[PDB]
Coordinates of C-alpha atoms in Angstrom, one line a residue:
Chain A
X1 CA 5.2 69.6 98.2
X2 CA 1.8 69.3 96.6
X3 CA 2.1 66.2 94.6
X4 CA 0.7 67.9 91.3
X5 CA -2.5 65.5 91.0
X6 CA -1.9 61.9 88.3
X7 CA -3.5 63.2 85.0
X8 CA -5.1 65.9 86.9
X9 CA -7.7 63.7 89.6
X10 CA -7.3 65.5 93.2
X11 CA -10.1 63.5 94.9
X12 CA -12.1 60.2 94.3
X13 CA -14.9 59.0 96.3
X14 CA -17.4 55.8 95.8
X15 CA -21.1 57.1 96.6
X16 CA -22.7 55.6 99.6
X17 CA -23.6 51.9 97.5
X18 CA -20.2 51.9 96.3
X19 CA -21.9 51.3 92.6
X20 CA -20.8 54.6 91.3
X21 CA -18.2 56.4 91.6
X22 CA -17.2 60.3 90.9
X23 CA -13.6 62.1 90.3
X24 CA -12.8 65.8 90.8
X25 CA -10.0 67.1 88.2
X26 CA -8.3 70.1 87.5
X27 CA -10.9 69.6 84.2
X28 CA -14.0 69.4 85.8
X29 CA -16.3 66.2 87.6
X30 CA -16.6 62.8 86.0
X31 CA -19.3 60.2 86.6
X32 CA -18.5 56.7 86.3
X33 CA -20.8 53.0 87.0
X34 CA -18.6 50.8 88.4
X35 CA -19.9 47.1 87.3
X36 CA -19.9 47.6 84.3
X37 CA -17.2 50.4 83.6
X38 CA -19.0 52.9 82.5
X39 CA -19.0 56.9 82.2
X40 CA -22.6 58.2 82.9
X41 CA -21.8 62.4 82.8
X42 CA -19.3 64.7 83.3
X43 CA -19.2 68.6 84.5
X44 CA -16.2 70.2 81.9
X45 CA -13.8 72.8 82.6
X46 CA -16.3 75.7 81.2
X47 CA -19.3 74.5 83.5
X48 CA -17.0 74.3 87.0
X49 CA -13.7 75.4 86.8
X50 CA -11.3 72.7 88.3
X51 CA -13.2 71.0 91.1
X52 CA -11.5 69.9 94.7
X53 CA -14.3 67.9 95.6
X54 CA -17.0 66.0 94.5
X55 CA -19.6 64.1 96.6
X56 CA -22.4 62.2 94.7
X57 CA -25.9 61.6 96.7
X58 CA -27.0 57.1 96.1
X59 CA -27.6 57.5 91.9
X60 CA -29.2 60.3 91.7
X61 CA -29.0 63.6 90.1
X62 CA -27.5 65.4 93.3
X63 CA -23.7 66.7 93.2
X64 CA -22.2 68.5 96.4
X65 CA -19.1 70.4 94.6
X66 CA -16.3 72.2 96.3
X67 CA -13.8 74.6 93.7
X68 CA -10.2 73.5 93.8
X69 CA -6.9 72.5 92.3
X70 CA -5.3 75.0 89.9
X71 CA -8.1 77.0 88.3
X72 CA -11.6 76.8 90.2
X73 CA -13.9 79.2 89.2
X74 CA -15.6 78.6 92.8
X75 CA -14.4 79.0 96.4
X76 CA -12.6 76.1 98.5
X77 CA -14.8 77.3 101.2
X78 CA -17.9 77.0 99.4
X79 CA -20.0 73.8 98.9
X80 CA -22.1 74.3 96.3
X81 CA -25.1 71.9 94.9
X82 CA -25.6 70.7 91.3
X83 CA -29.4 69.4 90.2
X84 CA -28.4 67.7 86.8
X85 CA -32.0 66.8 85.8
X86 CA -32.8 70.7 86.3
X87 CA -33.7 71.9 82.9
X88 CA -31.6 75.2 82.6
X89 CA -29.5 77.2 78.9
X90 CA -27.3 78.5 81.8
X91 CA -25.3 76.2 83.5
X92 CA -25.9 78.5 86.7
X93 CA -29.6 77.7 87.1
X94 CA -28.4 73.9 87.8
X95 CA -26.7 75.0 90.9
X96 CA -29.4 75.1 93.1
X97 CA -27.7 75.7 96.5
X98 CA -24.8 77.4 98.4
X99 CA -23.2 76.6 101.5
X100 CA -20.2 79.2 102.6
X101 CA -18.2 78.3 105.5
X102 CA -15.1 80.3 107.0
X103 CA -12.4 77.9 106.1
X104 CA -11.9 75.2 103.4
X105 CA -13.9 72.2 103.1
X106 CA -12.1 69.2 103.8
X107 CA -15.0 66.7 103.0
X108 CA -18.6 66.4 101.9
X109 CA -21.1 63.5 103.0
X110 CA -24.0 63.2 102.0
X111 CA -27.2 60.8 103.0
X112 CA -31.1 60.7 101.8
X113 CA -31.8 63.1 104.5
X114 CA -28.7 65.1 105.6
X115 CA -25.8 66.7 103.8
X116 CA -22.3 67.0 106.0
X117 CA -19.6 69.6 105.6
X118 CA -16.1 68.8 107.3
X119 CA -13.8 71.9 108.1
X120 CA -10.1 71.6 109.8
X121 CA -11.9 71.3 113.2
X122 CA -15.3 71.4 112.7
X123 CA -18.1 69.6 111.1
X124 CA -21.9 70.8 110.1
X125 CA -25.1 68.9 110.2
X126 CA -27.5 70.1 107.9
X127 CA -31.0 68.8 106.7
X128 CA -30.7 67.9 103.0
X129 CA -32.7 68.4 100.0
X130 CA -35.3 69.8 101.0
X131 CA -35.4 73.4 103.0
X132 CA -31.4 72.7 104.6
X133 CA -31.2 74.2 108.1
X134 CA -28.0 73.9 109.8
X135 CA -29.1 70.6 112.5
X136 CA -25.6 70.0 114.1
X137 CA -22.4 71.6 114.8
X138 CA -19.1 69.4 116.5
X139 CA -16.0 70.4 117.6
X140 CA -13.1 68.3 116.6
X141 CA -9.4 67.7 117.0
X142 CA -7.0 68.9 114.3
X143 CA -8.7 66.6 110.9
X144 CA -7.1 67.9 108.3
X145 CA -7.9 65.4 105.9
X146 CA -11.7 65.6 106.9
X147 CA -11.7 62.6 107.9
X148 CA -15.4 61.6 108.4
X149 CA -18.2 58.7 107.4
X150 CA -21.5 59.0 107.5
X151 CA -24.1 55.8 107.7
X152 CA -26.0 55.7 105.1
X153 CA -28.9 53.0 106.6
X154 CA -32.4 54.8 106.5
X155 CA -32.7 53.2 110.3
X156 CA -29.6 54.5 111.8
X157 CA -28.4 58.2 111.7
X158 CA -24.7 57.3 113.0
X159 CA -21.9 60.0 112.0
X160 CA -18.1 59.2 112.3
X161 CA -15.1 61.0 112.9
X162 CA -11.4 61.8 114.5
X163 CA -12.1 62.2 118.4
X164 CA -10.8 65.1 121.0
X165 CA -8.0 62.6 121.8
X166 CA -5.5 61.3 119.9
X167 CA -6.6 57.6 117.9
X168 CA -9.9 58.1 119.2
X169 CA -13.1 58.1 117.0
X170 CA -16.2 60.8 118.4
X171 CA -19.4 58.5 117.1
X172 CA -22.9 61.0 117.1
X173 CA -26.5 58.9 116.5
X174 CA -28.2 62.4 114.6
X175 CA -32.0 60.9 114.9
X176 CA -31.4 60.4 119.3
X177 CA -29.9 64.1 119.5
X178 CA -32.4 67.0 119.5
X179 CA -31.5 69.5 117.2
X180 CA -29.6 72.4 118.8
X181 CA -28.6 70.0 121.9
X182 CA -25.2 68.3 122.5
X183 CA -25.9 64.8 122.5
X184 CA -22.6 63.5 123.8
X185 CA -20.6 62.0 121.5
X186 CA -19.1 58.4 123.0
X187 CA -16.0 58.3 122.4
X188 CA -13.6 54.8 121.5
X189 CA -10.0 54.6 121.8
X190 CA -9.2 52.8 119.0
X191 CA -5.3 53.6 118.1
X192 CA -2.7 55.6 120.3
X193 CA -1.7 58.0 116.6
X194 CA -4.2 59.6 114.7
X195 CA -6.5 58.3 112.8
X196 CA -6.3 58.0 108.8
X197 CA -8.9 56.0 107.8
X198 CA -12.6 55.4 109.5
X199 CA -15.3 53.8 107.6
X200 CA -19.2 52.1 108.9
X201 CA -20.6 49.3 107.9
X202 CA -24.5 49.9 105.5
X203 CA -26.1 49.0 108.8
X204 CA -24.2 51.6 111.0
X205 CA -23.7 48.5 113.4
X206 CA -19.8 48.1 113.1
X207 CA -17.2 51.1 112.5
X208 CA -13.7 50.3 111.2
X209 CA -10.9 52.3 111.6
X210 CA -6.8 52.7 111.1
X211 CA -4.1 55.3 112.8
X212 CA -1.4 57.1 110.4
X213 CA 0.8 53.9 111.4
X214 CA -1.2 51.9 109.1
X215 CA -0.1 48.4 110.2
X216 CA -3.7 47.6 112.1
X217 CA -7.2 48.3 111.0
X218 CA -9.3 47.8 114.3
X219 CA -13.2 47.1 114.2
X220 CA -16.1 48.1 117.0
X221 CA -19.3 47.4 117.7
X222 CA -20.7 50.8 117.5
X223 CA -23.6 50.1 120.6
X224 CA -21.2 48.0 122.8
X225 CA -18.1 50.0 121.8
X226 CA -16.6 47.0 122.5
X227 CA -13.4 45.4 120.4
X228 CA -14.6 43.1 117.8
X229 CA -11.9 42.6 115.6
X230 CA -8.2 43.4 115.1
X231 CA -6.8 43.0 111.6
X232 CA -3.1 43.4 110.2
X233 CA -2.3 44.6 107.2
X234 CA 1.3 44.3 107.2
X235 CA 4.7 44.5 109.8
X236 CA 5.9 47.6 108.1
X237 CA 3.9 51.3 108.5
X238 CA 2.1 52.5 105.4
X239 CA -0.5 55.3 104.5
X240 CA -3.8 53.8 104.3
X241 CA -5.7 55.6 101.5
X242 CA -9.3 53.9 101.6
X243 CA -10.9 51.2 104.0
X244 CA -14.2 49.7 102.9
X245 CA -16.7 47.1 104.1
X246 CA -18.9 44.6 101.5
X247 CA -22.4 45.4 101.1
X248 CA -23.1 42.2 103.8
X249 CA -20.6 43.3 106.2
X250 CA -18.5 39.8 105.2
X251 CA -15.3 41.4 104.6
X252 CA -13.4 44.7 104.8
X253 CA -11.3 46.4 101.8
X254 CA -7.9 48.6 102.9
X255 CA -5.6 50.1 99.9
X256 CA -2.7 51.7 100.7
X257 CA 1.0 53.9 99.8
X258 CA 2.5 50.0 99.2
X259 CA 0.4 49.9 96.2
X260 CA -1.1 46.8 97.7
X261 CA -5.3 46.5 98.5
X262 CA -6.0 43.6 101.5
X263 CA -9.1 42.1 101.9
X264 CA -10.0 40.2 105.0
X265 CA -12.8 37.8 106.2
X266 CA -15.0 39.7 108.9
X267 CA -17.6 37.4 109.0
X268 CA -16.1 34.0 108.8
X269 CA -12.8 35.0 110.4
X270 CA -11.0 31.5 109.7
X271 CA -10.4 32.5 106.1
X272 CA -8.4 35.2 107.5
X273 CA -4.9 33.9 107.5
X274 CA -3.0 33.6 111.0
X275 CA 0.9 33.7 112.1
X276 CA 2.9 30.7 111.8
X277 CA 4.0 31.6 115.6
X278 CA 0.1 30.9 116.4
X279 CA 0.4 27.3 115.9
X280 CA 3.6 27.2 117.7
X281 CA 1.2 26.9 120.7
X282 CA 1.8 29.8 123.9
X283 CA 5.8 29.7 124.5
X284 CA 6.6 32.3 127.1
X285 CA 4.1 35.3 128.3
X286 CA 5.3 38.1 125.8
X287 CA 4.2 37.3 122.2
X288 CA 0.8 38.0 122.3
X289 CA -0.5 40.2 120.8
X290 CA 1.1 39.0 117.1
X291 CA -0.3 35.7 117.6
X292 CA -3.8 36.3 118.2
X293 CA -3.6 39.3 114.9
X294 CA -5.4 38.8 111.6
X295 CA -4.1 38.9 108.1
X296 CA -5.3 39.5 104.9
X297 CA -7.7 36.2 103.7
X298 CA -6.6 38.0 99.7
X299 CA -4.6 40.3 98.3
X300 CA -3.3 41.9 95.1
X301 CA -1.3 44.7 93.6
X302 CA -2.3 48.4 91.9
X303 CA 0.5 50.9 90.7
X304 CA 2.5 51.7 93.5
X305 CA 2.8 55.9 93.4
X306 CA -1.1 56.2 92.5
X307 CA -3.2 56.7 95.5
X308 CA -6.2 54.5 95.2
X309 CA -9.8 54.1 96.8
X310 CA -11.6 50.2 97.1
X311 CA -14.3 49.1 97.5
X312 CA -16.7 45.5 96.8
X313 CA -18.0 44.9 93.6
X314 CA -21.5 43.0 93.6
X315 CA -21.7 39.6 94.0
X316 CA -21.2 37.5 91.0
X317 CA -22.1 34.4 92.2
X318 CA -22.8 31.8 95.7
X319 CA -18.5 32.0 96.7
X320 CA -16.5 34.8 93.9
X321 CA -16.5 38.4 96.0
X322 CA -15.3 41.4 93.9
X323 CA -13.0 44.0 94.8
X324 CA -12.7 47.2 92.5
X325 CA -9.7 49.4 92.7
X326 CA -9.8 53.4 91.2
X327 CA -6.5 54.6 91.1
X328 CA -5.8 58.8 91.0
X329 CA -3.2 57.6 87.8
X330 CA -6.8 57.1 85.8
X331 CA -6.5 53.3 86.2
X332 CA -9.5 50.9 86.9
X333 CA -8.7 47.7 88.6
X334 CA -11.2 44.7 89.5
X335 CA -10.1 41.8 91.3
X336 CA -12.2 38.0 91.9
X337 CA -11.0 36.5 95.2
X338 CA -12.5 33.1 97.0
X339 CA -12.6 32.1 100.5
X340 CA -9.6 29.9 100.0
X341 CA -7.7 32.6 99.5
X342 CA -7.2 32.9 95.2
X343 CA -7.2 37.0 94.1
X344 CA -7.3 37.0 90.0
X345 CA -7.9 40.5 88.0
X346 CA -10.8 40.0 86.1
X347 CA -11.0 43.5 84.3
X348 CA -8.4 46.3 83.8
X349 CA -9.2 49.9 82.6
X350 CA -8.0 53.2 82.3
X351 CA -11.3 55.3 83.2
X352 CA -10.2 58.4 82.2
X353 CA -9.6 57.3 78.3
X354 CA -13.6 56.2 78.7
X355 CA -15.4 58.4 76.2
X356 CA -18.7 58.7 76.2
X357 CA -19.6 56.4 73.2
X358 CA -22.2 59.3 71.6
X359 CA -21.9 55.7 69.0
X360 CA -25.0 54.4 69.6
Chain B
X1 CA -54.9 105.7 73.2
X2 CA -53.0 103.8 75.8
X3 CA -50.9 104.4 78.4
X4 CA -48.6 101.0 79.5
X5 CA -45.1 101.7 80.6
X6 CA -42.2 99.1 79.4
X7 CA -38.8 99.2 80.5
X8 CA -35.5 97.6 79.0
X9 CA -32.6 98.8 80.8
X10 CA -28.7 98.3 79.2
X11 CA -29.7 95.7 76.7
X12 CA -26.8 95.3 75.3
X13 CA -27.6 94.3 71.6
X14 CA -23.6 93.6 71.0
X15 CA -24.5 91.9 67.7
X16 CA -21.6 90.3 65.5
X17 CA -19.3 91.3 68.7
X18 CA -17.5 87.7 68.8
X19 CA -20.8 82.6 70.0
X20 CA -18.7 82.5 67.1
X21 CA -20.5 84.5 64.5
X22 CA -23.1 87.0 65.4
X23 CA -23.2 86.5 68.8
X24 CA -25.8 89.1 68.9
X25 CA -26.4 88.9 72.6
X26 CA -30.0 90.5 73.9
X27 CA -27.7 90.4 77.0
X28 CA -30.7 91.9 78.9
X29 CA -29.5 93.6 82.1
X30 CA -33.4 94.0 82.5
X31 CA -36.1 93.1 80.8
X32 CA -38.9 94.0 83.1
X33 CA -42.5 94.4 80.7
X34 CA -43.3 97.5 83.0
X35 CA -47.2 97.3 82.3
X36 CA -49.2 96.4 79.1
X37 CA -53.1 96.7 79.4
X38 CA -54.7 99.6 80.2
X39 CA -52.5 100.0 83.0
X40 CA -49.7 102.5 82.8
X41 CA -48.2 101.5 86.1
X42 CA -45.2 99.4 87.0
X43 CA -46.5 95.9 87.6
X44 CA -43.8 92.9 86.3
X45 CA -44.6 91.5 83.4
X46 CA -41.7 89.2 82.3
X47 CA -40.7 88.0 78.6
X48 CA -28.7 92.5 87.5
X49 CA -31.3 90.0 85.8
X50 CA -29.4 89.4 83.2
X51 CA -32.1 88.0 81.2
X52 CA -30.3 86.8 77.8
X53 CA -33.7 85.9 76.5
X54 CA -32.0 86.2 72.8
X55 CA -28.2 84.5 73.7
X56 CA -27.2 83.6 70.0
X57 CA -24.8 81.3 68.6
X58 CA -24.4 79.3 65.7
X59 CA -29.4 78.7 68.0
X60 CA -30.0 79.3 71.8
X61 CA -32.0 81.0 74.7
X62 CA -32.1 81.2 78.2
X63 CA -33.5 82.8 81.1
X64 CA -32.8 84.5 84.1
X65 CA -34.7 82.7 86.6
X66 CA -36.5 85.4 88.5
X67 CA -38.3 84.8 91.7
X68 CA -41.6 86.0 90.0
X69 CA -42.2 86.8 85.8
X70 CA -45.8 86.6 85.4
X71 CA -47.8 88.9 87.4
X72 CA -51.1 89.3 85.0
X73 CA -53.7 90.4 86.5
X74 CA -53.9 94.1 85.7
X75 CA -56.9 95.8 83.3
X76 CA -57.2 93.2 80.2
X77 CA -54.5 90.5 79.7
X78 CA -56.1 90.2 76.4
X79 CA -56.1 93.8 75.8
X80 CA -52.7 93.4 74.3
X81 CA -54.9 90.5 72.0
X82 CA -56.8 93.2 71.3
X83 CA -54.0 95.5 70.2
X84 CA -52.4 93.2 68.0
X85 CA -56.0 93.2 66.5
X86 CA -55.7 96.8 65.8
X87 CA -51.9 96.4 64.7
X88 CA -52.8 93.8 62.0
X89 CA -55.5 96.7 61.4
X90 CA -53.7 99.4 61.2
X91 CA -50.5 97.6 60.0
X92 CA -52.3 95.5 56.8
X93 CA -50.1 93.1 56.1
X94 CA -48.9 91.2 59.0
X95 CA -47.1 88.3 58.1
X96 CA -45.7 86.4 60.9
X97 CA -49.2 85.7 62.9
X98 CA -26.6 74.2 68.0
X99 CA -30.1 72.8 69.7
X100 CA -31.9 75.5 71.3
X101 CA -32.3 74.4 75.1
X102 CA -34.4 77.4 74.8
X103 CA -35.5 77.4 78.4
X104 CA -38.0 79.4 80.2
X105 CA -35.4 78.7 83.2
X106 CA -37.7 80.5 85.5
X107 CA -39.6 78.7 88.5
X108 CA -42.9 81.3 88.0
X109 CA -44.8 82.6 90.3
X110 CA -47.8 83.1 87.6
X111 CA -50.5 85.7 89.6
X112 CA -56.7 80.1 76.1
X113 CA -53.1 80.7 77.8
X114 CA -54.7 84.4 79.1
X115 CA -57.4 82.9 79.7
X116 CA -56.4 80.6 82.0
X117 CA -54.0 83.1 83.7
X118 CA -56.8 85.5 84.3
X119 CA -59.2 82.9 85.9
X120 CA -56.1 81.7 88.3
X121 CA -55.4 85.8 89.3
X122 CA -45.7 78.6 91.7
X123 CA -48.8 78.1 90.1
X124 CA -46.3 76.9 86.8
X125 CA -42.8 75.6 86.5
X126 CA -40.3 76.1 84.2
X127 CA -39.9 74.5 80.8
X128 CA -36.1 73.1 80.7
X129 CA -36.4 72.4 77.1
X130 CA -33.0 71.4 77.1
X131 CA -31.8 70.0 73.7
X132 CA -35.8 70.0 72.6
X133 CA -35.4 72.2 69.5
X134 CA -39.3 72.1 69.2
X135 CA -39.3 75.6 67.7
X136 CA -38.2 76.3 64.2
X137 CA -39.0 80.2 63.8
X138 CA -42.4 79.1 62.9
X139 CA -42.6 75.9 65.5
X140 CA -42.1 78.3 68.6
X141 CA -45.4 77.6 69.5
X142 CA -45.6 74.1 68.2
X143 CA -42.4 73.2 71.0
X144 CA -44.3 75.6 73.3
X145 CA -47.0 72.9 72.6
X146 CA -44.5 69.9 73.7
X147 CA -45.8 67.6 76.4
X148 CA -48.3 69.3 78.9
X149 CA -47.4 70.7 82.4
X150 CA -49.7 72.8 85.3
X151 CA -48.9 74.0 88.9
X152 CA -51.3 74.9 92.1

């Protein structure tokens, strides 16, 4: 059962600053600012059909669009690009590119320097804006939620996604592979199910991820490959829907099917509470692994049956972090939280009752 | 006497078809200017292609964005000047001497306006008036004025 989409949103994505964000519809592409709430364009129903996917590039003018949902007037194989400060009386001469693929695309990601299209099983490099040539070309296991990140640090060309073996991620540095060569992929075991949610860090130094369990979200350093940090979001399985770090790497965003987003501490991981059985100091050699686990420092609550992306808001002042919630149900959510722990909604909005005020 | 070939293929002038009232479509399936000059023999001149130069509405244009419009560099670009001149002789009186987004929508490959395209025979880029409304049936050439732009 296709869920039919909430008011008509079938994907959501934050660009690469988490500043913006855009929404596909069955009516077209929307544009938002995050901080402030803000609509800055829209592609209508007559321009694009209903859109599957939409990937922004930074702020610019650059839209990678795949047709979807109930009435696309553009293929689900095709990613096409949209120039909106091209000039054109014909919405057609502001689609200035075409890539056609064999199957449907899964995800778009995009980067100063390099767009990426993610299939079932595989995923393309190409060299974006200028001239794209097809760079890259991986083999994956069964992804079919295109599960893939993309760093988006000018100094580190690190791609993301769902290794050959099951919980593990396949991790690719782009600028150390010659073009046309395999460049192995290293591989980290991070869950024993399959992954749901992978995410870098603006450096490209540390990748998070979560399995289709949802109850851990497990951090690596992504030279050492080693274990940095294992975090619990709750005893009880859930679908993780989006996991996000600050713009500092000091925390790390995860929303999820229990209409609940958790933030945690990554940086100062103290503020990050700890089990009650931690303090009840090492009785008998088979409790472990719950006592040494993580919790949420913060967390608070968004509609339950909307899937929603987070992400960080930016920084207010010296010790109040923001987290902003987009929910599929048209609803905008942003949250204050401290390092002792307090989580207050600041701002609530629904994002798709935003007009553009053409009053001014 | 002149002999300059000019094409229009399947323009289909639907007027008051529908773009609400007089639609009036140029619809141009091809507007290729065949030759003008002296020169009778196909060489593109510019204003499949679709070129709905004329799209109407109630008060728009557009262009069809061909890889090259402006090819001038055959006999006399001004020797269409020149038969305008003997037009407004031979015809005595000659009077005429939403938003529009009336785009030239066309990344040219070009090779006074003639002039200047004789002495350089890409090379130009494409107007994007969008929402400009500089012309006025008179103030073509006045938004045709707007700004200032050059290529190569």
């Amino acid at each position: 059962m296709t869920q039919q989409p909430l008011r008509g949103v079938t994907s959501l994505r934050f660009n690469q600053d988490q500043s913006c964000f855009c929404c596909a519809m069955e009516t077209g592409v929307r544009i938002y600012n995050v901080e402030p709430l803000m609509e800055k364009g829209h592609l209508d129903h007559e321009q694009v059909g209903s859109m599957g996917l939409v990937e922004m590039l930074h702020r610019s003018n650059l839209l990678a669009l795949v047709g979807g949902g109930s009435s696309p007037k553009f293929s689900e194989i095709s990613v096409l690009i949209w120039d909106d400060a091209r000039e054109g009386k014909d919405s057609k001469e502001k689609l200035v590119l075409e890539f056609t693929f064999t199957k449907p695309v899964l995800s778009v990601r995009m980067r100063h320097d390099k767009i990426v299209i993610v299939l079932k099983n595989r995923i393309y490099v190409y060299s974006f804006p200028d001239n794209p040539r097809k760079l890259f070309e991986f083999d994956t296991r069964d992804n079919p939620k295109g599960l893939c990140d993309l760093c988006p640090s000018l100094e580190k060309q690190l791609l993301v996604f769902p290794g050959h073996k099951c919980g593990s991620l396949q991790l690719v540095d782009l600028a150390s592979t010659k073009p046309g060569t395999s460049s192995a992929p290293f591989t980290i075991n991070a869950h024993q199910s399959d992954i749901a949610c992978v995410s870098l860090n603006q450096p490209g130094t540390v990748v998070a991820s979560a399995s289709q369990k949802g109850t851990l979200i497990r951090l690596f350093d992504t030279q050492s490959k080693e274990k940095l940090v294992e975090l619990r979001r709750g005893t009880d399985p859930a679908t993780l829907y989006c996991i996000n770090f600050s713009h500092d790497s000091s925390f790390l965003c995860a929303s999820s099917d229990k209409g609940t987003v958790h933030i945690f501490a990554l940086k100062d991981t103290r503020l990050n509470r700890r089990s009650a059985l931690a303090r009840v100091g090492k009785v008998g050699p088979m409790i472990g692994q719950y006592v040494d686990s993580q919790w949420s420092l913060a967390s608070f609550t968004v509609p339950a049956e909307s899937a929603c992306i987070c992400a960080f808001g930016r920084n207010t002042s010296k010790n109040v972090n923001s987290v902003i919630a987009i929910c599929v149900d048209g609803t905008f959510h942003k949250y204050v939280f401290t390092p002792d722990g307090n989580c207050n909604r600041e701002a609530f909005d629904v994002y798709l009752d935003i007009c553009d005020d053409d009053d001014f | 006497h002149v002999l300059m070939e000019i094409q229009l293929s399947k323009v289909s002038f639907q007027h008051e078809v529908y773009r609400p009232l007089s639609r009036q479509v140029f619809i141009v399936q091809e507007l290729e200017v065949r030759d003008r000059l002296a020169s009778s023999q196909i060489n593109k001149f510019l204003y499949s292609n679709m070129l709905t130069i004329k799209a109407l509405h109630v008060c728009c244009l557009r262009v069809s964005l061909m890889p090259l419009r402006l090819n001038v560099d055959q006999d006399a670009l001004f020797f269409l000047k020149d038969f305008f001149t003997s037009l407004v002789a031979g015809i005595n009186p000659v009077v005429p001497g939403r938003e529009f987004r009336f785009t030239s929508e066309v990344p040219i490959w070009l090779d006074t306006f003639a002039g200047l395209l004789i002495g350089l025979a890409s090379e130009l880029k494409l107007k994007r008036l969008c929402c400009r409304h500089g012309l006025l049936g008179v103030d073509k050439v006045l938004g045709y004025a707007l700004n200032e732009w050059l290529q190569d």
